[PDB]
Amino acid sequence: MVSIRRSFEAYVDDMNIITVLIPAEQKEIMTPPFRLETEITDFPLAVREEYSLEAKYKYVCVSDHPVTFGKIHCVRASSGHKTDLQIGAVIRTAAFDDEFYYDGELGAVYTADHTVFKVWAPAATSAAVKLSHPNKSGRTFQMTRLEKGVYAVTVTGDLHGYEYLFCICNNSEWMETVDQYAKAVTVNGEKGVVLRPDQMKWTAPLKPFSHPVDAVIYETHLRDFSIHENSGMINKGKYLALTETDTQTANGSSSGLAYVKELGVTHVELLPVNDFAGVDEEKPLDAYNWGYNPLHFFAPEGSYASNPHDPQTRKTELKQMINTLHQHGLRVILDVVFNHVYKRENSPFEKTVPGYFFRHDECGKPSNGTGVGNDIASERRMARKFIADCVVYWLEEYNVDGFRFDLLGILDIDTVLYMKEKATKAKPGILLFGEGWDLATPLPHEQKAALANAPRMPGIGFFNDMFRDAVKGNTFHLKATGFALGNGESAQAVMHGIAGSSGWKALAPIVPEPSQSINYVESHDNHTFWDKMSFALPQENDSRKRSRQRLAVAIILLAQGVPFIHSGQEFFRTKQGVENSYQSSDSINQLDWDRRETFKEDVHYIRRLISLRKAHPAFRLRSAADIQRHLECLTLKEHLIAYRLYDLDEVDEWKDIIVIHHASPDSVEWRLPNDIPYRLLCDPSGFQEDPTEIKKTVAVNGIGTVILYLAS
């Protein structure tokens, strides 16, 4: 690794302190007094303290006046030697943040007449914009430093289609980088692209969503969803697939958009659609990736587009997909990754303002609470601005309906509340939730947007890992089993989840209100419910396993809270035992439409459970207080849980509702809390077309759910 040759080193580690490092074998030569120099300036430096290091001797110096950024600084030793003042830790100080915070817009501001380019690079001494265009003249123009560390330049002419890169000079080293706010990029996101507004017209206006507990979330990956040969969709693994109406499998079973609509889901959650690394857009079939390797936060991923070479195309297709879903009454949730970037060292953040956008440990090294290399320092003011900017942009430009925050716990609460204010204002009713894991990132525990602090984040939901493990079984231990798999030890936790996880007797609340509990038993992470259960119950036949998985769905779908379903879960999706399929082949990750046909009856069961939920508000109480007033547990045994919803006068169409979950293949009788005749709406066999009436007792035969209801 080559480098600029320098006599000694000097860094601005704080607004008024300069650290001078002198190579050991020069300690007696390059000695103090040290002076700071710049055009029009030459001041003395006071040595607060000095001490030896491995191969260098250090001097912690103080300056009477705070360092002025944007200009090259020289520090001279008494020996006459000099070196350029480099950037130190000063960038991560509150003082530095308050001095340079910029509240204006950044990026490329286009007009048919001219484009204004702006980049925040407070610690830099120079910046320029590099313009290029297919078969055209390339030009690089110096940018001017304005207030708040912002560099800008106005380029006359119509820049539509022009590619651009920023050149930022930090510590006398120029780095080339894509605009952090790039809203379009070239294939494989190598350069940003300036594009005129595409005049997209949203023709499927939707009123703000009623309430979180009224949603049914369906998590899917754009490639997985339609890549299968029998998917019935033409644009396999592309944005346009979901725009295809009335598609069906070879045997005639509904597929794609029609399928999703038919299931009764309200929100389709998509894995990362912003540009990420992991798939060569030039050869999309040669590799696969979930997409959790952020490159450009304001631009779409190119492998899902019909043509990744034409900058506007991916934008057009993602917007059409979203508008079409809306035309069909479906809403969209975007999985976003503001907790880290792919390859910190070469990221736009690091190349523009070194050390600013990432958290560091006490030793000065990048923290790794995310476990993937770096943690975005959301608490830094321009980072908080970026995240808020990004969320509002996706809402305004792509008209989405919510966001699932990957590693939500890595973000700081103030940032979360700040973006929430801006996001809900731009789009009333949107869903905002994520995995509030308490991770080892350098933030005080009460500042982490973790589950534990849910009480301070009203309007933000969290994946309920407790309810997940209670029903399915511990996720960390393959063999561990949950209530649905026959473990009576988790019956109470399950009942707690059924009640919205907002407190149950001796059990402390998981979240304050049910609107904040994302109830699920499967997601793209870890083994699918089918594969997990297959390892935990190696001696159980497929038929029984199917009943257990259907049981887990009924528990979640008939539970207070916000139901979440992993795509393919409805038909026992399997990944061949793969635990973490982030980069596995399509054979592993594709949505198996053949399996969808095979278990069309099971899929139908979950469809009925969803319709049941939608037709009865009793399952969608809006507060822990209302739940305490209409839900009560009637029986809690190792393999049997019976609860009921009552006093539903102005709540439900039905006067009383009883739900019994049985997790054992044996048969048992269950006494009702009264002798009034009820309607047998469902049993382990599934829903009954013509509900028979039963009295005093009811048979509970095998694994499954029985539902009784009293009309009015």
Ligand SMILES: [Ca+2]
């Ligand atoms: Ca990409």
